[PDB]
Amino acid sequence: GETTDGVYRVMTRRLLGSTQVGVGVMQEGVFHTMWHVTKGAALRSGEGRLDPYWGDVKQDLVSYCGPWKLDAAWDGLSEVQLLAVPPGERAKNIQTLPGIFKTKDGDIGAVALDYPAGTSGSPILDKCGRVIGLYGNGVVIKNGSYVSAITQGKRE
């Protein structure tokens, strides 16, 4: 299968035609996506198979072939880019200044950008091109707009 670093679409042929259910990041031989995209199922990459290695429903994250490798964090001040990969459309970078999710367990960066559900798992980057989290787990606020957390895992 293809193990080149980069952003990938996660597809399924179970429904009508070929449907994009999400997106993920290949880095250091490990595939990273959100748990709600795959529900922890195995994935295919050409003729090869990717088996889950770690996952957590509460963080809404899952890694395949190895442990979670992404450890960069939003600095709390700078603009970032969502490398959005929408269903049936080309990868596109969108720059934005994150807002904040304030929780009883601390603050998390959040991006106020609205893309289809199939874009979940698209990476959010800093100015060095490092992945600071994945887009796709968030909330719908008063005016009906979507705000995603910047969801990042822990590198053991």
Add this chain to the structure above:
Amino acid sequence: DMYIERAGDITWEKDAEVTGNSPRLDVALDESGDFSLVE
């Protein structure tokens, strides 16, 4: 059966389209991984 297909490189694009606001929200995270608004 789920499969993956390469979509691109991960790089910062100089002069990308700049949009979106920066809301400061009070939220709660439940055991199922769902975020909700705290009012």
